[PDB]
């Protein structure tokens, strides 16, 4: 009978090829995902099998299994909306999450026909709660419910879920929705876990009541403020308290310390000195986040007692005084220390060479530290340091090559310092190294060829240094290079015709240098490449047609997540070139950006765009940015330059580019900024260029251009200056 339900399911798969070991002859138990207990089937798990079918399919077939205790469909691409269905009193668990499920959330009430079901996780789907809040969920036999990261918007929806009463509910998670207003779990006396993160609660700070059982409270990521201390005082039973990303103000309040292990008060309005009373919480306290608040003074020494604290992060506060080594050696718990964005001062303790052995990640960036980088830092044979963030500090003198002695180092960021003399060739030996960021320093000489023995090297950011000489060729051995930013150097030579070999290269920025000679057509071989900023240079040649060849097949999702700035070119200064500067900023501070002033002429009177890198497409996209401005680059701009759907900015300015603008230039739909200005281009501006409906900027100025301006479309919104100096042009608009 049962078997036949299981093949009855198999039918609906489109896509019959999944569940191949499911066949009528065999005994159901031998089936993929099918688990039996005494030769009867208690559970099916199809997880991460692309079922691509309706929910009501699944339930008609499976949920009717006499005796089935659980079903796991998570990430099955289960489609549809959850209806009433006949269901057995033995199915106690359902994982429908990482799915496509739709409708009102009220759909879920139907599951009341499944009488034994204590476990539901629907998270990461589309459920919304469209009209207005009342009725109930009326699923009260539930110990665990996870509705998180769905499409739900409302208020007292938390009240709605718990409405028919919560008594046996241990675990409740509604995160990553828009739910708002009041939370009361006060009735729920078994409740060990409440996750309300990433929501709209601006008002009620939850009412936990007795709080007898609660070990996990995540109220992070709301507009929530108000007195939380008094709220949570009833517990002392609690393992995690996450109140981060909220509106909380004031001194760190009395909060229960007995079982507290993780505590993040991070990213709030909290002011004051890290309190003594915190204290005995060191018994456990395996991690602490006070970062992003108003705190000052220095790391209170009692922090030597948490030998259980793996990671202390104090980043972005007023903390001052020199680097508290006295405390820092005492906690042999410590793994990551984040001191970033603070007023810590002084030279770099010798006395610190030890951390370098214990520590995974040392983040000292954006502080006042001076003198050089301890050559002796990595002298321990023991040394584990994965992540060294010394960027944005006052460190003088050469990069210690002895630093290679840190052999676990993946990310080395020395940037925004005063470091002089050359780049250690030494660094070539860091065999696990991925991110290397040296930009805005006084480093000179050549870009060390040895960097080739790094087979994991992903980032390379050299900007605003004196580095001379060509591109090291050995880099063609770096398979994982994605973001190469060499801008603002004296670098010579050409683009490597091998550059097209790096499947992963995404952002290549060669601005302000002397790099010369033709634009390599092999550039069209790079599946990942979305940002090409060649501006202010000595390049020869004509834009090749092969250059775009890959557009439309493009996947850039690797480069995604890296933090940056864009400084947009004011244009108001004669001297300043390009469309704009895309700079790596991680842990470099915003307000120290003027430290750039003397190297880059541009106004920081500008608007600085910025945030974490996110390509607007996953797969089958196009080159997102191209600036070839200010070169001797010349000739016919190919028809193929139309082949870039996702291209945001095109600046071909100040060149000898000649001939006429191809009609296809109308098909760059995602083009917001078009600058062909200051060229030898002639002829007429095709009215098919009306098609750029997102354009906020045009400059066609300084050409042999003739004819009328094509008014229908965005063109009329553009001040006539931007068409100036085309004697043969028919328009003003």
């Amino acid at each position: 009978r049962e078997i036949h339900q299981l093949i009855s399911f198999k039918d609906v798969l489109p896509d019959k090829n999944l569940l191949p070991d499911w066949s009528s002859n065999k005994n159901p138990c031998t089936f993929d995902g099918v688990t039996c207990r005494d030769d009867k089937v208690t559970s099916i798990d199809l997880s991460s099998k692309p079922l691509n079918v309706g929910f009501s399919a699944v339930s008609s077939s499976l949920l009717s299994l006499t005796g089935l205790e659980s079903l796991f469909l998570s990430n099955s691409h289960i489609n549809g909306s959850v209806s009433g269905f006949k269901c057995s009193a033995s199915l106690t668990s359902l994982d429908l999450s990482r799915n496509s499920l739709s409708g009102p959330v009220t759909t879920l009430t139907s599951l009341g026909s499944c009488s034994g079901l204590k476990f539901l996780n629907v998270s990461s789907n589309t459920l919304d709660f469209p009209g207005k809040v009342s009725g109930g969920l009326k699923l009260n036999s539930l110990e665990v419910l996870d509705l998180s990261a769905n499409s739900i918007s409302g208020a007292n929806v938390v009240g709605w879920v718990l409405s028919d009463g919560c008594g046996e509910l241990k675990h409740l998670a509604i995160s990553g929705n828009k739910i708002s207003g009041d939370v009361d779990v006060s009735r729920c006396v078994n409740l060990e876990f409440l996750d309300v993160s990433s929501n709209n609660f601006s008002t009620g700070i939850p009412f936990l009541g007795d709080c007898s059982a609660l070990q996990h409270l995540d109220i992070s990521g709301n507009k929530l403020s108000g007195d939380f201390s008094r709220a949570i005082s009833t517990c002392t039973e609690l393992k995690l308290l996450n109140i981060s990303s909220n509106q909380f103000v004031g001194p760190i309040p009395p909060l229960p310390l007995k079982s507290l292990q993780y505590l993040s008060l991070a990213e709030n309005k909290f002011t004051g000195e890290i309190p003594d009373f915190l204290s005995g919480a060191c018994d456990t306290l395996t991690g602490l986040d006070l970062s992003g608040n108003h705190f000052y003074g220095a790391v209170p020494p009692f922090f030597g007692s948490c030998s259980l604290l793996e990671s202390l992060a104090l980043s972005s506060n007023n903390f001052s005084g020199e680097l508290p080594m006295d405390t820092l050696l005492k906690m042999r718990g410590l793994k990551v220390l984040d001191l970033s964005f603070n007023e810590f001062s002084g030279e770099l303790p010798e006395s610190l060479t030890n951390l370098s052995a214990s520590l995974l990640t040392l983040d000292l960036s954006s502080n006042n530290f001076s003198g050089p980088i301890l050559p002796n830092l990595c002298q321990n044979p023991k040394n584990t340091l994965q992540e060294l963030y010394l960027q944005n500090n006052g460190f003088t003198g050469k990069i210690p090559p002895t630093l290679s002695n840190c052999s676990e180092l993946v990310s080395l960021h020395l940037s925004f310092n005063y470091l002089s003399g050359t780049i250690p060739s030494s660094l070539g030996s860091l065999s696990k190294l991925r991110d290397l960021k040296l930009w805005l320093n006084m480093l000179e000489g050549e870009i060390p060829q040895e960097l080739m023995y790094v087979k994991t090297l992903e980032t390379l950011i050299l900007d605003f240094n004196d580095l001379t000489g060509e591109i090291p060729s050995g880099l063609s051995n770096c398979t994982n290079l994605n973001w190469i930013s060499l801008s603002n150097n004296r670098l010579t030579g050409e683009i490597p015709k091998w550059i097209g070999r790096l499947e992963n290269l995404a952002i290549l920025k060669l601005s302000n240098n002397s790099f010369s000679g033709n634009i390599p057509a092999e550039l069209g071989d790079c599946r990942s490449l979305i940002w090409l900023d060649l501006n202010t240079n000595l390049f020869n040649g004509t834009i090749p047609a092969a250059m775009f060849k890959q557009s439309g097949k493009i996947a850039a999702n690797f480069i995604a997540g890296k933090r940056y700035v864009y400084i947009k070119n004011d244009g108001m200064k004669k001297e300043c070139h390009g469309a704009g500067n895309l700079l790596e900023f991680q842990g470099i501070r915003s307000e120290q950006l003027n430290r750039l002033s003397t190297r880059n002429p541009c106004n920081i009177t500008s608007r600085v765009y910025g945030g974490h890198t996110s390509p607007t497409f996953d797969n089958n996209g196009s080159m997102m940015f191209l600036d070839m401005s200010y070169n001797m680059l010349s000739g016919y701009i190919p028809k193929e330059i139309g082949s870039m759907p996702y291209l945001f900015i095109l600046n071909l300015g100040h060149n000898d580019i000649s001939g006429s603008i191809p009609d296809e230039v109308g098909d760059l739909r995602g083009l917001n900024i078009l600058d062909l200005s200051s060229n030898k281009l002639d002829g007429r501006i095709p009215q098919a260029m009306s098609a750029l409906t997102m354009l906020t900027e045009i400059d066609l100025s300084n050409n042999n251009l003739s004819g009328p301006i094509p008014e229908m479309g965005q063109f009329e919104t553009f001040p006539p200056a931007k068409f100036l100096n085309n004697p043969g042009l028919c328009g003003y608009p």
């Binding site: 009177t605 608007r607 917001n672 409906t693 997102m694 009329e716 919104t717």
Partner: protein
Amino acid sequence: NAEGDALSALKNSLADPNKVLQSWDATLVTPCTWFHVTCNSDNSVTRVDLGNANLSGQLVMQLGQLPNLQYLELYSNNITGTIPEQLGNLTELVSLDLYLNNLSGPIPSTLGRLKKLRFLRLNNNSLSGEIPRSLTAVLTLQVLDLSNNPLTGDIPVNGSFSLFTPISFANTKLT
């Protein structure tokens, strides 16, 4: 700022299937960094160009909050709804392009308040009502193309409309 608040209210009333408004960031200080939104040297909004975003939705009242807004192009979308009279509270303005939409209801008389307005295309929509005699008022308007939506009530010549061909009327159920 109140401006980011406003445009936010728009990102809500709107529906953004091509995710053009994604970059609009409600925590941000100003919405000056948003995509397609732009500002002056003083960090107030001078533009919003969502024009042809495949974006659907209703326009919204908070849209009146952008007093330095000049060019606003909501044009060539699936936008439904009426044209909010606080659109008139946007005193500076140049171009108003609602053209090529499904916007329903009266062409608001409050546009009589935008003296700087140099462009009006209420063109190609479905609108219902008079024209105001208050758009005779403005006199700048080097173009008004409102066509293709049913109005009548008359075709004004109070005369600021003196400067317009009827090519500007095309099917108004007019006169």
